[PDB]
């Protein structure tokens, strides 16, 4: 619709955040809208108007998790290497991830009724993304400044 794709791989361009607490013991996570039981991290599709990936990230973090913070690091890109449904390979999604230091969480936000939202230690957060079958999101988490204990 209004989405943007890599001119090389034709993959859909996404940006998101690893929203860490100030102490950096916990990371904010949200539930998928399609898969209502899977815990992921805030991200969404880049739109034409958006000048940089930081814009898409901070927007998507707000819309999806009602989270406000400053980007303290670029974590680089990870790919969603998901084989096409008629599989029985070019990547599906390129994600541009930033580390964000949480300044505030709001009780209202545009998908406050469509998603849940919780802070998880590195351990619980690792298992959640295993359960979710999203290792490219775990790769991003690992590039963060999160404490591993
Ligand atoms: O499920 C997947 C892809 P995967 O099954 O991991 O290969 O992602 C959907 C995405 O559709 P797709 O085009 O297949 O990537 C969904 O996107 C689309 O439907 C866009 P399109 O159908 O490709 O135009 C949508 O992703 P975006 O947030 O980036 O929009 C879904 O996110 P949701 O809104 O449910 O949180 C996202 O699910 P998830 O990341 O598990 O939460």
From Swiss-Prot:
<dbReference type="GO" id="GO:0005634">
    <property type="term" value="C:nucleus"/>
</dbReference>
<feature type="binding site">
    <location>
        <position position="33"/>
    </location>
    <ligand>
        <name>P(1),P(5)-bis(5'-adenosyl) pentaphosphate</name>
    </ligand>
</feature>
<dbReference type="GO" id="GO:0006798">
    <property type="term" value="P:polyphosphate catabolic process"/>
</dbReference>
<feature type="binding site">
    <location>
        <position position="64"/>
    </location>
    <ligand>
        <name>Mg(2+) 1</name>
    </ligand>
</feature>
<dbReference type="GO" id="GO:0008486">
    <property type="term" value="F:diphosphoinositol-polyphosphate diphosphatase activity"/>
</dbReference>
<feature type="binding site">
    <location>
        <position position="43"/>
    </location>
    <ligand>
        <name>1D-myo-inositol hexakisphosphate</name>
    </ligand>
</feature>
<feature type="binding site">
    <location>
        <position position="12"/>
    </location>
    <ligand>
        <name>P(1),P(5)-bis(5'-adenosyl) pentaphosphate</name>
    </ligand>
</feature>
<feature type="binding site">
    <location>
        <position position="134"/>
    </location>
    <ligand>
        <name>5-diphospho-1D-myo-inositol 1,2,3,4,6-pentakisphosphate</name>
    </ligand>
</feature>
<dbReference type="GO" id="GO:0046872">
    <property type="term" value="F:metal ion binding"/>
</dbReference>
<feature type="binding site">
    <location>
        <position position="43"/>
    </location>
    <ligand>
        <name>P(1),P(5)-bis(5'-adenosyl) pentaphosphate</name>
    </ligand>
</feature>
<dbReference type="GO" id="GO:1901909">
    <property type="term" value="P:diadenosine hexaphosphate catabolic process"/>
</dbReference>
<feature type="binding site">
    <location>
        <position position="60"/>
    </location>
    <ligand>
        <name>Mg(2+) 2</name>
    </ligand>
</feature>
<dbReference type="GO" id="GO:1901911">
    <property type="term" value="P:adenosine 5'-(hexahydrogen pentaphosphate) catabolic process"/>
</dbReference>
<dbReference type="InterPro" id="IPR047198">
    <property type="entry name" value="DDP-like_NUDIX"/>
</dbReference>
<feature type="binding site">
    <location>
        <position position="115"/>
    </location>
    <ligand>
        <name>1D-myo-inositol hexakisphosphate</name>
    </ligand>
</feature>
<dbReference type="InterPro" id="IPR000086">
    <property type="entry name" value="NUDIX_hydrolase_dom"/>
</dbReference>
<feature type="binding site">
    <location>
        <position position="33"/>
    </location>
    <ligand>
        <name>5-diphospho-1D-myo-inositol 1,2,3,4,6-pentakisphosphate</name>
    </ligand>
</feature>
<dbReference type="GO" id="GO:1901907">
    <property type="term" value="P:diadenosine pentaphosphate catabolic process"/>
</dbReference>
<keyword id="KW-0963">Cytoplasm</keyword>
<feature type="binding site">
    <location>
        <position position="60"/>
    </location>
    <ligand>
        <name>Mg(2+) 3</name>
    </ligand>
</feature>
<dbReference type="GO" id="GO:0005737">
    <property type="term" value="C:cytoplasm"/>
</dbReference>
<feature type="binding site">
    <location>
        <position position="33"/>
    </location>
    <ligand>
        <name>1D-myo-inositol hexakisphosphate</name>
    </ligand>
</feature>
<dbReference type="Pfam" id="PF00293">
    <property type="entry name" value="NUDIX"/>
</dbReference>
<feature type="binding site">
    <location>
        <position position="43"/>
    </location>
    <ligand>
        <name>5-diphospho-1D-myo-inositol 1,2,3,4,6-pentakisphosphate</name>
    </ligand>
</feature>
<protein>
    <recommendedName>
        <fullName>Diphosphoinositol polyphosphate phosphohydrolase DDP1</fullName>
        <ecNumber>3.6.1.52</ecNumber>
        <ecNumber>3.6.1.60</ecNumber>
        <ecNumber>3.6.1.10</ecNumber>
    </recommendedName>
</protein>
<feature type="binding site">
    <location>
        <position position="82"/>
    </location>
    <ligand>
        <name>5-diphospho-1D-myo-inositol 1,2,3,4,6-pentakisphosphate</name>
    </ligand>
</feature>
<dbReference type="GO" id="GO:0071543">
    <property type="term" value="P:diphosphoinositol polyphosphate metabolic process"/>
</dbReference>
<dbReference type="InterPro" id="IPR015797">
    <property type="entry name" value="NUDIX_hydrolase-like_dom_sf"/>
</dbReference>
<feature type="binding site">
    <location>
        <position position="12"/>
    </location>
    <ligand>
        <name>5-diphospho-1D-myo-inositol 1,2,3,4,6-pentakisphosphate</name>
    </ligand>
</feature>
<keyword id="KW-0378">Hydrolase</keyword>
<feature type="binding site">
    <location>
        <position position="115"/>
    </location>
    <ligand>
        <name>5-diphospho-1D-myo-inositol 1,2,3,4,6-pentakisphosphate</name>
    </ligand>
</feature>
<comment type="similarity">
    <text>Belongs to the Nudix hydrolase family. DIPP subfamily.</text>
</comment>
<feature type="binding site">
    <location>
        <position position="43"/>
    </location>
    <ligand>
        <name>Mg(2+) 1</name>
    </ligand>
</feature>
<dbReference type="GO" id="GO:0034432">
    <property type="term" value="F:bis(5'-adenosyl)-pentaphosphatase activity"/>
</dbReference>
<keyword id="KW-0539">Nucleus</keyword>
<feature type="binding site">
    <location>
        <position position="115"/>
    </location>
    <ligand>
        <name>P(1),P(5)-bis(5'-adenosyl) pentaphosphate</name>
    </ligand>
</feature>
<dbReference type="GO" id="GO:0034431">
    <property type="term" value="F:bis(5'-adenosyl)-hexaphosphatase activity"/>
</dbReference>
<dbReference type="GO" id="GO:0000298">
    <property type="term" value="F:endopolyphosphatase activity"/>
</dbReference>
<feature type="binding site">
    <location>
        <position position="12"/>
    </location>
    <ligand>
        <name>1D-myo-inositol hexakisphosphate</name>
    </ligand>
</feature>
<feature type="domain" description="Nudix hydrolase">
    <location>
        <begin position="10"/>
        <end position="142"/>
    </location>
</feature>
<feature type="binding site">
    <location>
        <position position="32"/>
    </location>
    <ligand>
        <name>P(1),P(5)-bis(5'-adenosyl) pentaphosphate</name>
    </ligand>
</feature>
<feature type="binding site">
    <location>
        <position position="136"/>
    </location>
    <ligand>
        <name>P(1),P(5)-bis(5'-adenosyl) pentaphosphate</name>
    </ligand>
</feature>
